[PDB]
Design a protein around this ligand. Structure first.
Ligand SMILES: Cc1cc2c(cc1F)OC[C@@H](NS(=O)(=O)c1cc(C(=O)N3CC(C)(C#N)C3)c(C)[nH]1)C2
Length: 129
């Protein structure tokens, strides 16, 4: 199905998975299976400086969830995170819109912005201002 994104997570550079991992640590802090559920996610969404609803919190979860159980694993995270910044996840219809870089800024900081994606160095990089 989403082989593009599914495989994309693997195409990423060492710096990508490395930085992304540093965030997942805190993102899935306390989770049952180190995943990102409505609770683990809702805690981050608000940490950025917002306050979403519980009904919507589940939406985004399953929206990216591969199993559709209500959680997001490592790969599943990169699958949506890889397109997050690209703005090619699903669309920008409703006002709601979560950014990848923004989130990282909370988990870690600016480290996951300029010195995040190493692909820009030599590897190909599309939709990357
Ligand atoms: C499990 C997981 C999934 C998603 C995550 C991060 C994750 F941890 O981030 C991206 C998200 N895709 S999305 O369409 O941007 C998106 C954002 C939101 C949302 O609840 N809000 C935007 C907000 C912060 C405001 N204002 C409230 C919704 C419902 N979809 C899907």
């Amino acid at each position: 199905g989403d082989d593009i994104y599914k495989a994309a997570v693997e195409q990423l550079t060492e710096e990508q998975k490395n930085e992304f991992k540093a965030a997942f640590d805190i993102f899935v802090l306390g989770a049952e299976d180190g995943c990102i559920s409505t609770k683990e996610l809702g805690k981050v969404m608000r940490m950025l400086g917002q306050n979403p609803t519980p009904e919507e919190l589940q939406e985004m979860i399953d929206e990216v969830d591969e199993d559709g159980s209500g959680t997001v694993d490592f790969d599943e995270f990169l699958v949506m995170m890889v397109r997050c910044m690209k703005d090619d996840s699903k669309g920008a219809g409703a006002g709601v819109r979560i950014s990848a870089d923004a989130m990282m800024q909370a988990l870690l900081g600016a480290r996951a912005k300029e010195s995040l994606d190493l692909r820009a160095h030599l590897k190909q990089v599309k939709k990357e201002d």
